[PDB]
């Protein structure tokens, strides 16, 4: 895997700031169901979809990327909901993601 660092500038969509991608995974989920991971014991957070033309795509995020950190916060041992919350803080317009890519 290769380390990538992406800088997402969230888009205003109504009252919300959106990122333009979807996630799967988390320590509370069944890792054997993750179609993207090389190691099916990997309980990490993975990008499962990327919106064409959205903030994530523009920043260079790709389907299947594993999210290691968001704004310096470790994402390797969090629940699915904890990951969702970290990525979607309404006070944060810019989020930097450290990811690994196969």
């Amino acid at each position: 895997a290769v380390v990538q660092r992406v800088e997402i500038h969230k888009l205003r969509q109504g009252e919300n700031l959106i990122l333009g991608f979807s996630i799967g995974g988390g320590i509370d989920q069944d890792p054997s169901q993750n179609p993207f991971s090389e190691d099916k014991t990997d309980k990490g957070i993975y990008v499962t979809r990327v919106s064409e033309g959205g903030p994530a795509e523009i920043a260079g995020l790709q389907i299947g990327d594993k999210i290691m950190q968001v704004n310096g916060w470790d994402m390797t041992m969090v629940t699915h909901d904890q990951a969702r919350k970290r990525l979607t803080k309404r006070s944060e317009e810019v989020v930097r993601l450290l990811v690994t890519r196969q």
Binding site: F21, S22, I23, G24, D30, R84
Partner: peptide, 8 residues
Amino acid sequence: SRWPTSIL
């Protein structure tokens, strides 16, 4: 189904 995803 047994593996939820979330839109962000």
